Amino acid sequence: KVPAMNKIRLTNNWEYLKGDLGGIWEAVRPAAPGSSEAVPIWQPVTLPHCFNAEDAVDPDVNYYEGPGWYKTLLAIDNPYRNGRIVLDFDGAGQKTDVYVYTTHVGSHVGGYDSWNVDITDAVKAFLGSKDAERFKGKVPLSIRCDNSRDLEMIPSDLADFNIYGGLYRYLNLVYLPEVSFEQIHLESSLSSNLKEGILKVKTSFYNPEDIRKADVTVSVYDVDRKPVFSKTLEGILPLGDQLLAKMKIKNPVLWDVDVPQLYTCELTVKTPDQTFTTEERFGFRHTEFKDKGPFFLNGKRLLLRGTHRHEDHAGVAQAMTEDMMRREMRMMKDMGVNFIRLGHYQQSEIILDLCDELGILVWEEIPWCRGGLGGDVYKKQARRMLANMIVQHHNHPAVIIWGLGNENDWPNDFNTFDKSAIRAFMKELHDMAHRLDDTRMTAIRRCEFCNDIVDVYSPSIWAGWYRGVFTDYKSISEQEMQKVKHFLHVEWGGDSHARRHSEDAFYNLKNIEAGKGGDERAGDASLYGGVPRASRDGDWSESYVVRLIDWHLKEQETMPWLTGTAYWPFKDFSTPVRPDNPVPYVNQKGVVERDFTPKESYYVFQSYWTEKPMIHIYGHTWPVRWGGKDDRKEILVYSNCDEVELFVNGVSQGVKRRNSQDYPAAGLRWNCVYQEGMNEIRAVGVKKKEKKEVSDVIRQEYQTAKWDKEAACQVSLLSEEGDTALVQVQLIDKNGIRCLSSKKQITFEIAGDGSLICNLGTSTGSRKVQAYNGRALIRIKRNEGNSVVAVKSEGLPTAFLELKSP
């Protein structure tokens, strides 16, 4: 539950086994070295851990969906007298069973909600047994996690993300005294004029020893951590539910996306044998969706500037650490985000705390995501995960929407599809959300035959990607908003293979018909069939998506009725249904790469959405441009500055004034001659409001030679950093000319002491990857030794590079 300094992340001294054991005895039985019990061999791991850290993006295998085991020897020493030992799971995928020695102590189905197990009694029983001697005072903890495919479990394997397995969020050892808090619910409301706040403090006690009386103190501190309320309830019954306090705050400090400010509620439960303190934060804010209108925060219109995220990261799959999450959420805030839909499931509470602290409003949904509707167990799981999500995240001021599902019109996990049954269950979930928490709105995305059930509705609008042209975005949005009481557009964008650029982003896109919608339908997401569309025919360069995002954002400045939108997603993430993407098994629509490297599109959002002066010439990852000699090449600058001057090789190209509606690049575009060879492009901006000057500089080569078809791979050592070498491949034609438009797939192999830094799900961390402008990079960990790298490409001679260590 909620503790403090008694919460211990169990990260070290774990072992992992892919696959099942024959019974719990195999995890704990005596095993001599070299015996039959000494196989299978387990892998030492540090938690958090995901079964699929590598195989989700490995280009040659289906990611593992099945059982796996973890074991540790727990060093238990409870600092509380007669205290409790609780295992607190931030989240584990998907079905988990927990054992203390040979005793099954808990189970859970659901990969995204938190849950816990009190193991006090099992530990005591184990420690009192003759078997305890062999474990040298420690307690064997064995945990089975299972992400086997299961049609009767949400989410559906039809979904566009990995249904990951393992202990991929922190597992906490929580020591508690005799009496603690099982639940703390802070009900906050804000009066009509916003000058009066009401706080009700409700709690559920955890009291397995049946202590009859306790003294409970409730204290509330303001945003400066000064106390504004304190009350002690003497001799209360600390059992079950208790309302501890009801209080009115005059002139409360409001939580806002620009100034996120939180109050703190500190609860203490005292007996003769304990003093136990924990705290919980909350915020005061008023939210309102206008009928056929926009969104209001604290009585003022706020355009939601949104993104999404999956719990997925390079090298670790779902097993992100707290530091990784803080960096990601800080990157979002620095981009100007004020709204996020947390993918298709409840996310780590670390993320929710960061949204409270950084000022990011939240839509959080259950993973009822495609496939239809299952039987009683499926439904019981959905209800349980909805209730768990609302109960667990109720206090976060960031949350404004509880989502009930995504693309529930997508069939075929069952041999029937019954719209009426889906409506009935959707209404049951909506009713449950309002029964549990009527201060927030319910929502779904893309299920038109349920659009009368939920409070807030999103259709599918992928203008310029899965359908139509992106200049239809505004008109499609105008038509769609009129169909529902509260319209909120979640998911739009396009894929970009990071570091791939184009001199003509529309080269194969000139015959896409406008005026025929922009929704994703069955078959549009696949690589085959359908009608002409950028998702199928586009080059997947960053150059196209930068122009697509630019368009959407400048249109939103002229849509005063719009609640807002959320781009899909913030960061590239792995998906099992896209084996043939330029990075295999990665959805590449992010504006950030899967390893946190910003794409060029990140700066488009930042230039529109932030006030801190910045300036970004497009093409930081574009080393070689091309065209005719003395052709005037378009240069785009993404900046929030009021005026920008561009310099090419030190020669001024003139000052331009920023104007969002002067598309593209908000008027900050130039057409300049590049010299054959290297060029230095510099941009200098001033932001009048800040009286600040900022600059950006890039270097680009310009190639006038035309190229024939790919003929060879040229492989070279580009640079080194310690034990790591960066290898570059360049596709060239029969005359040695760089094939700057090539998308040919390149394969890396290594033999010797080193290893490829591959399976990261990034365009520079993939052992099979489509070229970006005829080039491909990968890093090699040399391991202080010698290796040979081979580079393969279909129909081309294989090339080799030796890597030596000094």
Question: Is residue 104 at the binding interface for its own copies, with CB under 8 A as the rule?
Answer: no
Using CB under 8 A as the binding rule, whether residue 1 contacts its own copies is answered as no
* Closer of 297 and 432 to its own copies (Cβ): 432
For residues 332 and 567, the answer to whether their CB atoms sit within 8 Å is no
Binding mask 445-484 for its own copies (x = CB under 8 A): -------xx-------------------------------
Quick one: what does residue 281 bind among its own copies, Na ion, none, with the CB cut-off 5 to 8 Å set by partner type?
A: none
Helix 542-556 × helix 473-481 angle, to 10°:
50
Is 546 in contact with 601 (CB distance < 8 Å)?
A: yes
* Span from 144-152, 237-245, 293-301, 455-463 in contact with its own copies (CB under 8 A): 237-245
Amino acid letter, residue 254: L
Q: Which does 430 bind (CB under 5 to 8 A by kind): Na ion, its own copies, none?
A: its own copies
Task: Kindly state the smallest distance separating residue 463's Cβ from its own copies, in Å.
Answer: 29
Tokens of 14: 């774990």
- The entry of its own copies, Na ion, none that residue 7 binds, CB within 5 to 8 Å by partner kind: none
Q: What CA–CA distances, in Å, run from 447 to 40, 371, 426, 429?
A: 47, 12, 10, 15
By CB under 8 A, the count of residues binding its own copies is 20
* Partner whose binding site includes residue 585, from Na ion, its own copies, none (CB under 5 to 8 Å by kind): Na ion
Site string for its own copies, 200-219 (x = CB under 8 A): -------x-xx-x-------
* Residue placing its CB nearer to its own copies in the complex, 77 or 291: 291
Tokens matching residue 469? 């042209």
Nearer to Na ion, 405 or 613 (CB): 405
Spell out, one character per residue from 417 to 436, where the chain touches its own copies: x when CB under 8 A holds, - when not. Answer: --xx--xx--xx-xx--xx-
- Could you tell me the smallest distance in angstroms from the CB atom of residue 536 to Na ion? 22
| Interacting residues of 261 by C-beta distance below 8 A, sequence separation 6+ | 223, 253, 254, 255, 283
In the complex, the smallest distance separating the C-beta of residue 439 from its own copies, rounded to whole angstroms, is 15
DSSP state of 575: -
Q: Which of 237, 514, 678, 788 binds its own copies (CB under 8 A)?
A: 237
- Residue 431's binding partner out of Na ion, its own copies, none, with CB under 5 to 8 Å set by partner kind: its own copies
- C-beta of 429: minimal distance to its own copies in Å? 9
Ramachandran sector of residue 137 (left: φ over 0; alpha: ψ -120 to 50; beta: rest): left
**Cα gap 360→368, rounded to integer Å:** 24
Which DSSP string do the residues of 274-322 spell out, in sequence order? Answer: EEEEEEEEE-B--EEEPTTS-EEETTEE--EEEEE--S-BTTTBT---H
Side-chain half-sphere exposure of 712, counting CA atoms within 13 A: 10
Catalytic residue positions?
407
**153 contact choice in Na ion, its own copies, none (CB below 5 to 8 Å, kind-dependent):** Na ion
Nearest to 163 by CA among 27, 324, 344: 344
| Least distance between Na ion and beta carbon 368 (Å) | 10
Give the nearer residue to its own copies in terms of CB position, either 176 or 257: 176
CB 757 → Na ion: shortest distance, Å?
A: 17
278, 270 in Cβ contact below 8 A? Answer: no
The CB-of-280 to its own copies minimum distance in angstroms stands at 20
Residues that bind Na ion in the complex, under the rule CB under 5 A: 58, 63, 150, 153, 156, 585
DSSP state at residue 772 = B
Contact yes or no for 141/72 (Cβ under 8 A): yes
Asked if 463 contacts 473 with a C-beta cutoff of 8 angstroms, the reply is yes
Pick out residues in 712-731 that bind its own copies (CB under 8 A).
none
669 binds, among its own copies, Na ion, none (CB under 5 to 8 A by kind): none
Rounded to the nearest angstrom, the gap between the alpha carbon of residue 350 and the centroid of all alpha carbons in its chain is 12
The amino acid present at 301, given as its one-letter code, is R
Beta-strand relationship, 287-289 and 441-445: unpaired
Pairing label, strands 586-587, 615-617: unpaired
Which spans of this chain sit near its own copies (rule: CB under 8 A)?
207, 209-210, 212, 237, 239-241, 419-420, 423-424, 427-428, 430-431, 434-435, 452-453
